[PDB]
């Protein structure tokens, strides 16, 4: 129940998910915490995306093997194993950026998003039109 404009590019190589908002890269820490950092030398910002179905992806830390996931209350966390909370609908936005909508909570438009201060947005606080939800996958 969402548009199907997909971004180009593939999932062959890992990427850094750069957030246009504050300029932070999405980060999945060893303890399961998820946030953003501007430090390009960080070892937990390298992410491998994989397509599960057309337009659906898993976003995994290449350093720890953890899956990006959004919980029942909209909080991003790092999961040790893949589950329905780890699937995201990857879509093009503003004819340029990549956005990631929680498949599980797609009806409520809960996006992956980073605030200018580097902390993740909670699902319910995200919405189309915010810069917090706009990402650019950059080469590692």
d(C-alpha 78, C-alpha 61), whole Å: 9
Q: How determined?
A: X-ray
6, 55 Cβ separation under 8 angstroms: yes
Feature table: binding site:
21
Instruction: Give the single-character DSSP code of 117.
Output: T
d(C-alpha 63, C-alpha 47), whole Å: 8
* Domains contained in the chain, CATH given: 1-140 (2.80.10.50)
Question: Cα–Cα distances in Å, from 128 out to 12, 23, 49, 65, 134?
Answer: 28, 18, 22, 30, 9
d(C-alpha 35, C-alpha 2), whole Å: 26
Feature table: binding site for heparin:
21
């Amino acid at each position: 129940h969402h548009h199907f404009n997909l971004p180009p590019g593939n999932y062959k190589k890992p990427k850094l998910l750069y957030c246009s908002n504050g300029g932070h890269f999405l980060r999945i820490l060893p303890d399961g915490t998820v946030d953003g950092t501007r430090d390009r030398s960080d070892q937990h910002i390298q992410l491998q995306l994989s397509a599960e179905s057309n337009g659906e992806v898993y976003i995994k830390s290449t350093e720890t093997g953890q899956y990006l996931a959004m919980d029942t209350d909209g909080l991003l966390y790092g999961s040790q194993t893949p589950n329905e909370e780890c699937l995201f609908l990857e879509r093009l936005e503003e004819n340029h950026y990549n956005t990631y909508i929680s498949k599980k909570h797609a009806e409520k438009n809960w996006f992956v998003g980073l605030k200018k201060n580097g902390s993740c947005k909670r699902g319910p606080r995200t919405h189309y039109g915010q810069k917090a939800i706009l990402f650019l996958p950059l080469p590692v």
